[PDB]
Design an enzyme around this catalytic site. Structure first.
Site, PDB file in Angstrom:
ATOM      1  N   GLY A  99       0.820  -1.197   0.000  1.00 59.80           N
ATOM      2  CA  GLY A  99       0.000   0.000   0.000  1.00 59.80           C
ATOM      3  C   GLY A  99       0.859   1.254   0.000  1.00 59.80           C
ATOM      4  O   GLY A  99       2.086   1.164   0.075  1.00 59.80           O
TER       5      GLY A  99
ATOM      6  N   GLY B 193       2.708   4.529   1.278  1.00 54.87           N
ATOM      7  CA  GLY B 193       3.271   5.015   2.522  1.00 54.87           C
ATOM      8  C   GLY B 193       3.451   6.517   2.513  1.00 54.87           C
ATOM      9  O   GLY B 193       3.380   7.150   1.457  1.00 54.87           O
TER      10      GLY B 193
ATOM     11  N   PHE C 281       5.620   8.576   2.169  1.00 55.89           N
ATOM     12  CA  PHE C 281       6.450   9.217   1.161  1.00 55.89           C
ATOM     13  C   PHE C 281       6.370   8.547  -0.195  1.00 55.89           C
ATOM     14  O   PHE C 281       6.157   9.212  -1.210  1.00 55.89           O
ATOM     15  CB  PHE C 281       7.901   9.269   1.638  1.00 55.89           C
ATOM     16  CG  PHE C 281       8.092  10.121   2.855  1.00 55.89           C
ATOM     17  CD1 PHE C 281       9.140   9.887   3.734  1.00 55.89           C
ATOM     18  CD2 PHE C 281       7.195  11.143   3.137  1.00 55.89           C
ATOM     19  CE1 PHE C 281       9.285  10.658   4.878  1.00 55.89           C
ATOM     20  CE2 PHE C 281       7.331  11.916   4.275  1.00 55.89           C
ATOM     21  CZ  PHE C 281       8.377  11.673   5.149  1.00 55.89           C
TER      22      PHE C 281
ATOM     23  N   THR D 109       5.852   4.236  -1.263  1.00 57.72           N
ATOM     24  CA  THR D 109       4.941   3.111  -1.290  1.00 57.72           C
ATOM     25  C   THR D 109       5.538   2.020  -0.413  1.00 57.72           C
ATOM     26  O   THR D 109       6.757   1.878  -0.336  1.00 57.72           O
ATOM     27  CB  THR D 109       4.759   2.593  -2.734  1.00 57.72           C
ATOM     28  OG1 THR D 109       5.445   3.467  -3.642  1.00 57.72           O
ATOM     29  CG2 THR D 109       3.279   2.560  -3.110  1.00 57.72           C
TER      30      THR D 109
ATOM     31  N   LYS E 228       9.375   0.726   3.031  1.00 54.66           N
ATOM     32  CA  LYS E 228       8.720   1.941   2.571  1.00 54.66           C
ATOM     33  C   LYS E 228       9.747   2.733   1.777  1.00 54.66           C
ATOM     34  O   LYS E 228      10.848   2.980   2.266  1.00 54.66           O
ATOM     35  CB  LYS E 228       8.227   2.770   3.756  1.00 54.66           C
ATOM     36  CG  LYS E 228       7.332   3.931   3.355  1.00 54.66           C
ATOM     37  CD  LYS E 228       7.525   5.135   4.272  1.00 54.66           C
ATOM     38  CE  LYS E 228       6.473   5.189   5.370  1.00 54.66           C
ATOM     39  NZ  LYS E 228       6.563   6.460   6.137  1.00 54.66           N
TER      40      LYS E 228
ATOM     41  N   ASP F 177      -0.434  11.211  15.466  1.00 52.94           N
ATOM     42  CA  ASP F 177      -1.370  10.501  14.611  1.00 52.94           C
ATOM     43  C   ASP F 177      -1.714   9.110  15.142  1.00 52.94           C
ATOM     44  O   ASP F 177      -1.971   8.189  14.368  1.00 52.94           O
ATOM     45  CB  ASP F 177      -0.787  10.394  13.203  1.00 52.94           C
ATOM     46  CG  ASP F 177      -1.840  10.095  12.153  1.00 52.94           C
ATOM     47  OD1 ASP F 177      -3.040  10.037  12.499  1.00 52.94           O
ATOM     48  OD2 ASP F 177      -1.461   9.918  10.974  1.00 52.94           O
TER      49      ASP F 177
HETATM   50  C1  LIG Z   1      -0.441  -3.311   5.145  1.00 53.84           C
HETATM   51  O1  LIG Z   1       0.782  -2.815   5.683  1.00 53.84           O
HETATM   52  C2  LIG Z   1       1.500  -3.638   6.490  1.00 53.84           C
HETATM   53  N1  LIG Z   1       1.113  -4.868   6.790  1.00 53.84           N
HETATM   54  N2  LIG Z   1       2.106  -5.332   7.612  1.00 53.84           N
HETATM   55  C3  LIG Z   1       3.107  -4.396   7.825  1.00 53.84           C
HETATM   56  N3  LIG Z   1       4.234  -4.492   8.571  1.00 53.84           N
HETATM   57  C4  LIG Z   1       4.998  -3.368   8.553  1.00 53.84           C
HETATM   58  C5  LIG Z   1       4.687  -2.193   7.843  1.00 53.84           C
HETATM   59  N4  LIG Z   1       5.561  -1.076   7.892  1.00 53.84           N
HETATM   60  C6  LIG Z   1       5.334   0.195   7.511  1.00 53.84           C
HETATM   61  O2  LIG Z   1       4.278   0.609   7.031  1.00 53.84           O
HETATM   62  C7  LIG Z   1       6.474   1.106   7.700  1.00 53.84           C
HETATM   63  C8  LIG Z   1       7.635   0.880   6.979  1.00 53.84           C
HETATM   64  F1  LIG Z   1       7.695  -0.167   6.120  1.00 53.84           F
HETATM   65  C9  LIG Z   1       8.748   1.733   7.138  1.00 53.84           C
HETATM   66  C10 LIG Z   1       8.681   2.810   8.029  1.00 53.84           C
HETATM   67  C11 LIG Z   1       7.508   3.034   8.753  1.00 53.84           C
HETATM   68  N5  LIG Z   1       7.435   4.117   9.671  1.00 53.84           N
HETATM   69  C12 LIG Z   1       6.894   4.109  10.906  1.00 53.84           C
HETATM   70  O3  LIG Z   1       6.368   3.127  11.429  1.00 53.84           O
HETATM   71  C13 LIG Z   1       6.966   5.209  11.552  1.00 53.84           C
HETATM   72  C14 LIG Z   1       7.222   6.467  10.992  1.00 53.84           C
HETATM   73  C15 LIG Z   1       7.280   7.605  11.832  1.00 53.84           C
HETATM   74  C16 LIG Z   1       7.078   7.462  13.223  1.00 53.84           C
HETATM   75  C17 LIG Z   1       6.823   6.190  13.762  1.00 53.84           C
HETATM   76  C18 LIG Z   1       6.604   6.012  15.265  1.00 53.84           C
HETATM   77  C19 LIG Z   1       5.101   5.974  15.605  1.00 53.84           C
HETATM   78  C20 LIG Z   1       7.264   4.715  15.752  1.00 53.84           C
HETATM   79  C21 LIG Z   1       7.215   7.127  16.001  1.00 53.84           C
HETATM   80  N6  LIG Z   1       7.698   8.003  16.580  1.00 53.84           N
HETATM   81  C22 LIG Z   1       6.770   5.078  12.924  1.00 53.84           C
HETATM   82  C23 LIG Z   1       6.405   2.174   8.583  1.00 53.84           C
HETATM   83  F2  LIG Z   1       5.272   2.385   9.281  1.00 53.84           F
HETATM   84  C24 LIG Z   1       3.497  -2.166   7.087  1.00 53.84           C
HETATM   85  C25 LIG Z   1       2.703  -3.317   7.098  1.00 53.84           C
END
Ligand SMILES: COc1[nH]nc2ncc(NC(=O)c3c(F)ccc(NC(=O)c4cccc(C(C)(C)C#N)c4)c3F)cc12
Length: 265
Positions: free
Chosen positions: A17, A19, A21, A23, A36, A129
């Protein structure tokens, strides 16, 4: 230390999906991971400052209830890798597949989430968020908080979890610990009623407007019949329209570990 994951090591896969910035893809790097990325090849110096920021924040987090940052990549495109969570977001469980949780597992999902925010806050990190979409139930237990963005279900924004001060845009920086606490309050509200707030209103702007003027607020009289009077009592202390009347998480957390200790009956 260095978390730079060298070129060619990551193996991008199925498209998961969109993200923040670029995807999010479910890839491989010593096991399943999420990657991401940035779809465009042009690093907007205003975007790179963001990647160089997100990486900057994940890097500080290291705890069972925050998503695990495993490494970043600058080589082709810019990427940030987190563990791959097997399961669904709480928003998905609650509002899409309509999973039915027993009160105990509920209180627990609540307690982990709180457990998690507490940590982010102790590290002086505002989430900005928090919401059932960004709360992931990894393997159906073990809440994993992160900011998944548009991966996970569903200029705009997510109105329901914003505390009023935010929804207004008072003093340009409305966000605070108590900001989060409110968002958490709506999450509590979701867990305790299996619903999102203000479902009987079908106009976003009016919701934004009223929640801002403090004319509208969550209908707490919808809590599931068996909810503990302390969960309900806490719910409100978190959703207080006045920023400074809200509890911070070390108290919130404890108010939960207390009510969770006395209800197996
Ligand atoms: C359907 O999508 C998915 N299914 N399973 C999955 N498993 C992992 C992912 N993973 C993600 O969506 C993902 C990724 F792949 C890389 C970086 C971040 N960033 C963060 O989590 C993040 C960014 C800024 C601040 C913070 C926090 C809240 C920690 C702070 N401060 C976190 C992500 F969320 C997606 C998935």
């Amino acid at each position: 230390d260095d978390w730079e994951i060298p070129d060619g090591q990551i193996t991008v896969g199925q498209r998961i999906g969109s993200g923040s910035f670029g995807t999010v893809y479910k890839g491989k790097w010593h096991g399943d991971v999420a990657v991401k990325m940035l779809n465009v090849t042009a690093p907007t110096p205003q975007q790179l400052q963001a990647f160089k920021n997100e990486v900057g924040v994940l890097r500080k987090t290291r705890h069972v209830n925050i998503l695990l940052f495993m490494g970043y990549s600058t080589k082709p495109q810019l990427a940030i890798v987190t563990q791959w969570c097997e399961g669904s977001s709480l928003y998905h469980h609650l509002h899409i597949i309509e999973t039915k949780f027993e009160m105990i597992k509920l209180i627990d999902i609540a307690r982990q989430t709180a457990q998690g925010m507490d940590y982010l806050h102790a590290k002086s990190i505002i989430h900005r968020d928090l919401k059932s979409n960004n709360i992931f139930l990894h393997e159906d237990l073990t809440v994993k908080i992160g900011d998944f963005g548009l991966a996970t279900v569903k200029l705009s924004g997510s109105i329901l979890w914003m505390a009023p001060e935010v929804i207004r845009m008072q003093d340009k920086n409305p966000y605070s610990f108590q900001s989060d606490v409110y968002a958490f309050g709506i999450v509590l509200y979701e867990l305790m009623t299996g619903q999102l707030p203000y479902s009987n209103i079908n106009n976003r702007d009016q919701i934004i407007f009223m929640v801002g003027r403090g004319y509208l607020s969550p209908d707490l009289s919808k809590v599931r019949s068996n909810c503990p009077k302390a969960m309900k009592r806490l719910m409100a202390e978190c959703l207080k329209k006045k920023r400074d009347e809200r509890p911070l998480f070390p108290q919130i957390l404890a108010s939960i570990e207390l009510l969770a200790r006395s209800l197996p009956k």
